[PDB]
Amino acid sequence: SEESQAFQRQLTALIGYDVTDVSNVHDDELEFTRRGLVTPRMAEVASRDPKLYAMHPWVTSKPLPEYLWKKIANNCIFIVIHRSTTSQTIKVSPDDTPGAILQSFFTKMAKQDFVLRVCGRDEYLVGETPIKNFQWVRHCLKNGEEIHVVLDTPPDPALDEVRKEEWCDRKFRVKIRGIDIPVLPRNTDLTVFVEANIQHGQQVLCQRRTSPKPFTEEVLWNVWLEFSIKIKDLPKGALLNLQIYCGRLLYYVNLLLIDHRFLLRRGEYVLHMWQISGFNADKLTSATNPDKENSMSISILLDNHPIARAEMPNQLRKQLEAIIATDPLNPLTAEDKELLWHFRYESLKHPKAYPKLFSSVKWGQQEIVAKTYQLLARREVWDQSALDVGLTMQLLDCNFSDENVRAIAVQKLESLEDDDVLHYLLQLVQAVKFEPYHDSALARFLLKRGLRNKRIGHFLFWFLRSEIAQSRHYQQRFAVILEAYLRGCGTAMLHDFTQQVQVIEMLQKVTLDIKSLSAEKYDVSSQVISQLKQKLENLQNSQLPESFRVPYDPGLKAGALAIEKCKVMASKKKPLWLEFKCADPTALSNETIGIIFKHGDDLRQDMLILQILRIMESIWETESLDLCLLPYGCISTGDKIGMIEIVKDATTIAKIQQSTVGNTGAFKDEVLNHWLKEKSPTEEKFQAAVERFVYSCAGYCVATFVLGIGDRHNDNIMITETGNLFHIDFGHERVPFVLTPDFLFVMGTSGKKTSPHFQKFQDICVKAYLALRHHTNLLIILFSMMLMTGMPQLTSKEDIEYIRDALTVGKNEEDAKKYFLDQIEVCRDKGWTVQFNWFLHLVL
Ligand SMILES: CC(C)n1nc(-c2cccc(O)c2)c2c(N)ncnc21
């Protein structure tokens, strides 16, 4: 119909890719996955509660941490309800429901359907949760702030309405006909061959190279390549991995040997390949290069149909248990593998053995695969174990291509509350890049969770859209999933989304136009500032949505530019610092929503780092630590371009240093402390400032050491007026982290002595450090996946191994404590050295 075609034009615009275009396909897996996702979409659409979906309470079952209780010395919580311009203050108990609080207000005012919504924000205190278990309430306690709330009507569930949809035993062999590219690289002519790997879980089941031959624009072989593997032994999800070396890896492509209908892949292929840049998730994709013109191809012919205990000794269990207790980057020896396999049944009793156990399977042998499947049919120990998110992520990584091993991981994710999904969501989305097939249990989990909760849905959208606009390697898969999400999120979220896209479409247009106008020369010129104001005026008239939702903070609705406060910014890239009126008349404050828009950097790395930071704060929350990190908002929108939350009342440490003298890399030990007292109206708030600085300094020193990003120049560390240190700009002699003598002086100490605030700082660092170490396995897997889904060509030992050593694996708590305090001292020894070394470097 002529409306299903319009609705699909809507979808294409939101997605930024056309899921009906079939110019870069060679089978129908993408189409098949669209039909396939209709069922789980519709199952979740129909069973979701209209009321709770529209209002999307943001809630948790975790206990209020000890540090937040201590901010309620009375078992009462002060909440403030509003109308017209009236307001009263109801004393309330933490265990009280929102329901119970209304009837202790309606009675307090009178002796009809209303809900308490947060002032300034699309966010609600509704549902059968104690008010202490709402996230907005926990945020207002953390921040020393009054819980402000209006009284008004539930939003019409009807607005969320969804549009009805109108939906043998021979060896395997491949023929390498030849390769063809129109323009030959650059250097001279070096020789070229084709390497054909049979690959499963990044494990090479078997390998065969063609003969070497001259590297011309056109090279032909006409060779069958016989593999050691039989056809009946190919596991589901095995890739034919075709690669080309000269010298030396220059090109790769992949073909799924078995397809989405379980059929062996037959016949002629001309595959357009990806070029290497100058191990990671890009190397794994079943997508072909869509640039059919510049790119290198390979031609092949497949012509090959179906298919679908007794008790241990003692020191061996010790061996088995030692292997099991060992960390996720510990290489399994052939000895070790056979041990796990032979004693698979005993191994199955330990949910932690699972990664190593399933990575001890010979996936290239059908009878053994089958035994593995019989192993898992009896997974009752697995099904009763508490969710261990780290274990689960290991099974969803690049080392497992079996649908059945991967599905028991997904099954375990099911008991994650929405709160926890939010924390892992970006890496679960990235883990879709390790699925052999487009339709997986992991894709369907994300779809369902997205659809069940607007907050999850929102972020799912932007996280998928981030990959769809930048990764040639996975945009088709991510687009099919995004469409499926969009086809059920509701007409009110589609509207909201459509506006958000329109805004960052316009603003990035402006961002790029301004980069051209002042090249590199560091001055911000008056002429180029003068165009920025013109261009923004223009969009505010007859182009820019009256109001859009802040992608990194979907509660907030931004309204109109404050053109006056906007400015092209003083860096080499030319980011737009932008400020917006809030569109909500009931906002308590009058402050602006600030957003930095910038091209030049890969913001996906920034996203990855920030999200680990959040995870890290949650870990510290499980042990009643609060490190006052400031994991600011940040979303990649396109190629080397995206948005960043502006943090209020913040300045760089560099700036604070350059105000006093503003010199050629000179530095002052005392200026940070003087800046703090200046910004604090009372000595009272100043001690609240030195406090936050001690915690926040400690948070970032630990976090940042663990992730290996601690050696930063001053320009990229900031502080709020009220004491919060935070690192910025993670987009890609030495120091383990930045504890400089100006930081040290705030702590009431000077090069090599002690103080109350520095004793505090040390011991907090130790508490926080060894708290991360309790989740060593989870952090190692996030880091690893981060490196594989987030950066260029990284090392499956070397780069990954950094975090093992940094988390000082396999050490008792006293060695660790020691190691980390030794790092606190390397920073003291060195002082200004590295910081000064940068200005030495700009001439170097
Ligand atoms: C202007 C100052 C140096 N600054 N840089 C910021 C950046 C942080 C992260 C990446 C950037 O490109 C810039 C920043 C912020 N997010 N909030 C407040 N102030 C900020």
From Swiss-Prot:
SUPFAM superfamilies (UniProt xref): ARM repeat, C2 domain (Calcium/lipid-binding domain, CaLB), Protein kinase-like (PK-like), Ubiquitin-like
Pathway: Phospholipid metabolism; phosphatidylinositol phosphate biosynthesis
Catalytic activity: a 1,2-diacyl-sn-glycero-3-phospho-(1D-myo-inositol) + ATP = a 1,2-diacyl-sn-glycero-3-phospho-(1D-myo-inositol-3-phosphate) + ADP + H(+); a 1,2-diacyl-sn-glycero-3-phospho-(1D-myo-inositol-4,5-bisphosphate) + ATP = a 1,2-diacyl-sn-glycero-3-phospho-(1D-myo-inositol-3,4,5-trisphosphate) + ADP + H(+); a 1,2-diacyl-sn-glycero-3-phospho-(1D-myo-inositol 4-phosphate) + ATP = a 1,2-diacyl-sn-glycero-3-phospho-(1D-myo-inositol-3,4-bisphosphate) + ADP + H(+); L-seryl-[protein] + ATP = O-phospho-L-seryl-[protein] + ADP + H(+)
Coiled-coil segments: none
Domain C2 PI3K-type, first and last residues per copy: 168-303
Domain PIK helical: 309-488
One GO cellular component, as annotated: phosphatidylinositol 3-kinase complex, class IB
Superkingdom of the source species: Eukaryota
Record-linked InterPro entries: ARM-type_fold, C2_domain_sf, Kinase-like_dom_sf, PI3/4_kinase_cat_dom, PI3/4_kinase_cat_sf, PI3/4_kinase_CS, PI3K-type_C2_dom, PI3K_ABD
Region (Catalytic loop): 708-716
One annotated GO molecular function: protein serine kinase activity
Activity regulation text: Activated by both the alpha and the beta-gamma G proteins following stimulation of G protein-coupled receptors (GPCRs). Activation by GPCRs is assisted by the regulatory subunits (PIK3R5 or PIK3R6) leading to the translocation from the cytosol to the plasma membrane and to kinase activation. Inhibited by AS-604850 and AS-605240.
Pfam family membership, one: PI3K_C2
EC number: 2.7.1.137, 2.7.1.153, 2.7.1.154, 2.7.11.1
Modified residues (Phosphothreonine): T776
GO biological process, one term: innate immune response
Region annotation G-loop: where it falls in the sequence: 568-574
Gene3D superfamilies: 3.10.20.770, C2 domain (2.60.40.150), Phosphatidylinositol 3-/4-kinase, catalytic domain (1.10.1070.11), Phosphatidylinositol 3-kinase Catalytic Subunit, Chain A, domain 4 (3.30.1010.10), Phosphatidylinositol 3-kinase, accessory domain (PIK) (1.25.40.70)
Protein residues bound to ATP: 594-603, 629-637, 726-732
Annotated transmembrane regions: none
Subunit text: Heterodimer of a catalytic subunit PIK3CG and a PIK3R5 or PIK3R6 regulatory subunit. Interacts with GRK2 through the PIK helical domain. Interaction with GRK2 is required for targeting to agonist-occupied receptor. Interacts with PDE3B; regulates PDE3B activity and thereby cAMP levels in cells. Interacts with TPM2. Interacts with EPHA8; regulates integrin-mediated cell adhesion to substrate. Interacts with HRAS; the interaction is required for membrane recruitment and beta-gamma G protein dimer-dependent activation of the PI3K gamma complex PIK3CG:PIK3R6.
Additional observations: Candidate target in therapy for inflammatory diseases. Selective inhibitors and protein ablation are anti-inflammatory in multiple disease models such as asthma, rheumatoid arthritis, allergy, systemic lupus erythematosus, airway inflammation, lung injury and pancreatitis.
Family, similarity comment: Belongs to the PI3/PI4-kinase family.
Described function: Phosphoinositide-3-kinase (PI3K) that phosphorylates PtdIns(4,5)P2 (Phosphatidylinositol 4,5-bisphosphate) to generate phosphatidylinositol 3,4,5-trisphosphate (PIP3). PIP3 plays a key role by recruiting PH domain-containing proteins to the membrane, including AKT1 and PDPK1, activating signaling cascades involved in cell growth, survival, proliferation, motility and morphology. Links G-protein coupled receptor activation to PIP3 production. Involved in immune, inflammatory and allergic responses. Modulates leukocyte chemotaxis to inflammatory sites and in response to chemoattractant agents.
Disease: Immunodeficiency 97 with autoinflammation: An autosomal recessive disorder with variable features. Affected individuals have childhood-onset antibody defects, cytopenias, and T lymphocytic pneumonitis and colitis. Some patients may have features of hemophagocytic lymphohistiocytosis.
Record-given protein name: Phosphatidylinositol 4,5-bisphosphate 3-kinase catalytic subunit gamma isoform
Organism in which the protein naturally occurs: Homo sapiens (Human)
Lineage, broadest ranks: Eukaryota, Metazoa, Chordata, Craniata, Vertebrata
